[PDB]
Design a protein around this ligand. Sequence first.
Ligand SMILES: O=C(O)Cc1c[nH]c2ccccc12
Length: 415
Amino acid sequence: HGGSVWDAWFSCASNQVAQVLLTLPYSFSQLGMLSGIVLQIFYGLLGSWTAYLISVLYVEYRARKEKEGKSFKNHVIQWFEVLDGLLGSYWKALGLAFNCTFLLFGSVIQLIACASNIYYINDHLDKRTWTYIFGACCATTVFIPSFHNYRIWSFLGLGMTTYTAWYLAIASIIHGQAEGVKHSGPTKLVLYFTGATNILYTFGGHAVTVEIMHAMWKPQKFKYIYLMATLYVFTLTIPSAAAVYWAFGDALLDHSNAFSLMPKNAWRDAAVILMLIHQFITFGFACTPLYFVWEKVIGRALARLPVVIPIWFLAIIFPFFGPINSAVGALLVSFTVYIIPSLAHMLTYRSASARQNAAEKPPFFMPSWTAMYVLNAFVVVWVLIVGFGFGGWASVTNFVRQVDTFGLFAKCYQC
Ligand SMILES: O=C(O)Cc1c[nH]c2ccccc12
């Protein structure tokens, strides 16, 4: 029987980094080594803190509900229901819109990544119609009611992502310096900020953390799981991305995907196959809550047939891999992952009486709530400035430049 603490850690490790492990070298080449590492560590700490914040919010909500006299024997609670139960009505609507649109764009991003990854295996025709082909495969997931057995998928994802990251790191050991390798790190404004926003995408929770833990016999212990997961990711990602960037110099500015330039061999082929499988599985994971909300609002494929088609069409109309990541980071992720949780926490715990009856006290090494106040202020201000205030100022400019250079419904991109 799955759903245990170990299974929760496996699922967190599998989900926290699914497809951004291939774009990160592009962001690093866009940013640099030292700055990239610093930003990754800072955003990892912030993501872990926000995960703890969401966990404590859920724990408090559950405590209040159990005080009221509500039972959840056959019920599962999502993030928006908690937002409704804490803040109000318009706030519930905002949270739903944000997380739902974020999940839709995440499905689109996953489809784009899957298509781009398969593009490097065996291609003899135009890429757009290949995405058309993958559309039917993506839509076929409607038949399965749900991925109840998340344990096997989490195990496979963890193992295969570990192997892929380790191989990406290892190959560069003898791959050697690129012919006439050149490193320049940051160059100017738009590119630097675009990379600094695309990094934000892969170091949060991706608005799935709420259900990641349910069924756990000890729900209150999410800090351990997340911290281990975030760290595990660090070990997987920092060496791999750093090694790839060092090996290939400034060749990642135009070839965002790593597999584009690596030599063709059996190990690489296995890596791309594993990445495609993981991309499909995580696409299903991301789409499941959207399907659930859609069914619950509207009232065995016809129920969710009219929701996939927009996803497929939006993936088709845009073939961009990294720019889309930057845009979603500067527009959607930067709101439904960091700003909303902090704002909700502060709004709910503004008064002192609620603090007195807190479900969970913060651990020893933060001996005051004033530190929490100041940390929330710092995170919200910083994410507003560089996430929404200026991250978009670069991401949207990059998208406009893209469309200028390629237009709409581009058949092939980065080729
Ligand atoms: O695929 C990604 O870019 C990141 C990611 C991991 N799990 C997700 C669930 C929904 C949307 C995006 C993601």
